[PDB]
Subunit: 124 residues, 2 copies
């Protein structure tokens, strides 16, 4: 069973995001926020400790680029989250997305943009 990931970019930097309808919150790792050069967007007011783990702060409505579309998304930054990016139900709802396992695509409902889930050999 191949897990669901998509390609996306933040501030022009490519990453692979895990698509998890069972997660309430979208979360980027601190390492990925550094690589994407977006620490200036990290509001440390919203620092805390996640379940399971320091949340370093929160990014408000930054653009996540999927194919050629730019979608405004908020997400928190977790220290030492192994994976770069976890796209949770908050985001999937915001943008009225469909996870379509027949076509093997994530559809962004607000735009009609469609992106293929990565094949097994491309998963991180």
């Amino acid at each position: 069973v191949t897990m669901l990931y998509i390609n996306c970019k933040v501030n022009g930097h490519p990453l692979k995001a895990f698509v998890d309808s069972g997660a309430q919150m979208t979360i980027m790792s601190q390492a990925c926020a550094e690589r994407c050069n977006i620490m200036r967007l990290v509001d440390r007011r919203w620092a805390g400790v996640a379940k399971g783990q320091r949340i370093i702060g929160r990014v408000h409505l930054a653009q996540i680029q999927i194919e050629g579309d730019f979608l405004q998304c908020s997400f928190s930054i977790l220290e030492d989250q192994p994976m770069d990016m976890l796209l949770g139900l908050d985001m999937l709802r915001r943008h009225q997305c469909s996870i379509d396992l027949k076509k093997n695509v994530l559809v962004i409902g607000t735009t009609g943009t469609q992106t293929y889930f990565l094949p097994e050999g491309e998963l991180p």
Copy 2:
């Protein structure tokens, strides 16, 4: 700033339950308590025991009027009755459609609504 989850109605062996729809989970898992309530303990193959009690190789999960052939493991003390994971979502070519607010079974076209907050288990 910060710091409704997806559920559907379904039935197993005629008994209703609410399933958590989790595309980040590899495996579909029913609680032992639910397996007992649905009266399907006879289907549990305990050679797959770990805590996972065993595996149900074949059971019908009913969604609306659809009967879908599924496999799932049985977990002692899982809080929710069923976690519907990517194995079964992929098997039945499902769409999780958050614009329409439905789970679509791709093999039949059947749709079921995600439950509102007040109906969550």
